[PDB]
Amino acid sequence: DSHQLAKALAEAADVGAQMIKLVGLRELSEAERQLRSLVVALMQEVFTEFFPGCVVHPFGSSINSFDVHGCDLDLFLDLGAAMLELVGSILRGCVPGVYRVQTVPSARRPVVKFCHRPSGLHGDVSLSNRLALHNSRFLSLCSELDGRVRPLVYTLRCWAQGRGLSGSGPLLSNYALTLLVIYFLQTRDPPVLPTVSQLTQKAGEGEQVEVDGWDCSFPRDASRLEPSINVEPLSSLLAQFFSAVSSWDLRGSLLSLREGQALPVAGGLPSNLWEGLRLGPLNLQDPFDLSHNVAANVTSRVAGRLQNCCRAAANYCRSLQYQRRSSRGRDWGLLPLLQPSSPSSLLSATPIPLPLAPFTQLTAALVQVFREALGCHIEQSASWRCALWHRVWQGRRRARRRLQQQTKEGGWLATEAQVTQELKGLSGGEERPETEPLLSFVASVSPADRMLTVTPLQDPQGLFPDLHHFLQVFLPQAIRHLKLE
């Protein structure tokens, strides 16, 4: 992980060589591709026995040439929930080697997750997703159009993973991030990649394909398209990326890869906002399905954190450490970007889900949960500054056991408070004047969605993550039990 990446990238030339070497290291080997193709052959053969004339299409991370080690194997089955169950049972029962089979109809794109034992692979089986095929082939096409695309995407992907800006949650999907990189490359003054409109209008004869009413047509080879007039190197394009996405207006702009342009949400959105297009903190238009915002799942927190981390990364890219190499210095160039973010930062990033309740009642409830039941000293969306001189998050089992033992030999809130107090007195201390808290933090609740965002202030012993997990479990319990009274 950090050993391989650091020792391999620190020894190579400049930033560009680092990016390319990173691509070389993280891309799938020949054996891995062989394994994948063989399993796909298994799937295809069995499904051909049961569904004559059906085609299993590998898509996603496999064919977009952004593939990484241990990536998912995504399969589109070309032949509603009941049919999904049928496919799942066929997987489970027939094709050899698959064991974990779990149906997920609930997603926007219903899929059957499966796990193949002998190859140790895993993936999704989608009954209908045809857009994934064509836009993945579009991605691979982009990687064919210019050679800087793949290094940029690999680097920025690993970076976003490190920063916790990408994920299966409210975070940006890898597809969304890739589309962001491509869009960035389309908007350069010497454009790196042609717009999707240009690819469709150029295209070629016999390449017409329409999926769900959207035109998926693009050239199948990069040879017929003229190269880029952009002479910019990798490092410059990286810094320019960070700067660009940090300086952009995300809420007021729908980024179109089709048009290669930022269209204002302010009523600069033609065709009456193509029906089914969700607007929000980040608006990124799919190059093919225009009614689909690939970033529609991205919340305000994630977008803001994106722009912040991109601003900090852009500031780093202007530094000397990034530009010039280092001899035996382990951290130079690409490496600090690829270095993962602090677990404290990562946890302050992820919010804490709270039960349904009126905002006012919920906030009052929370400050009650911090005031008593926890040793917190609190003071004034809603936000509170809390301080702790004791470890509240640990030892509560022994404490409540002790109290119940004193109950043996001799509703909510205050009882837990007793626990906290008896954690405090026997024995964390008597506290003290002059204070200087053990752990101090900030609790914030937004009106919608209602989620607690806990960020650390003073954490000398670095025990904040313990507190964060503790709160993750405890605060919903607190609110729930307070509701039960």
Residue numbers in the entry: 145 to 223, 337 to 637, 763 to 792, 802 to 876
The authors write:
After transcription, the 3′-end is oligo-uridylylated by a terminal uridylyltransferase, TUT1 (TUTase6)910, one of the members of the non-canonical nucleotidyltransferases. TUT1 is composed of N-terminal Zn-finger, RRM, palm, fingers and KA-1 domains. The C-terminal region of TUT1 is a previously unidentified RNA-binding domain, and it was named the KA-1 domain. Thus, the present structural and biochemical studies have demonstrated that TUT1 acts as a U6 snRNA-specific terminal uridylyltransferase.
Therefore, the amino-terminal putative zinc finger (ZF) and RNA recognition motif (RRM) (amino-acid residues 1–140), the predicted disordered proline-rich region (PRR: amino-acid residues 235–304) and the carboxy-terminal region (amino-acid residues 651–750) neighbouring the nuclear localization signal (NLS) were removed. The truncated TUT1 (TUT1_ΔN) was overexpressed in Escherichia coli, purified and crystallized. The form-III crystal belongs to the space group P43212, and its structure was also determined and refined to an R factor of 21.4% (Rfree of 25.8%), using reflections up to 3.4 Å resolution. The form-III TUT1_ΔN adopts a closed conformation, as compared with the form-I TUT1_ΔN. A comparison between the form-I and -III TUT1_ΔN structures highlights the mobility of the KA-1 domain. The KA-1 domain rotates by ∼40° with respect to the catalytic core domains, using α14 as the axis of rotation. The N-terminal RRM is mobile relative to the catalytic core domains, and the C-terminal domain KA-1 domain rotates relative to the catalytic core domains.
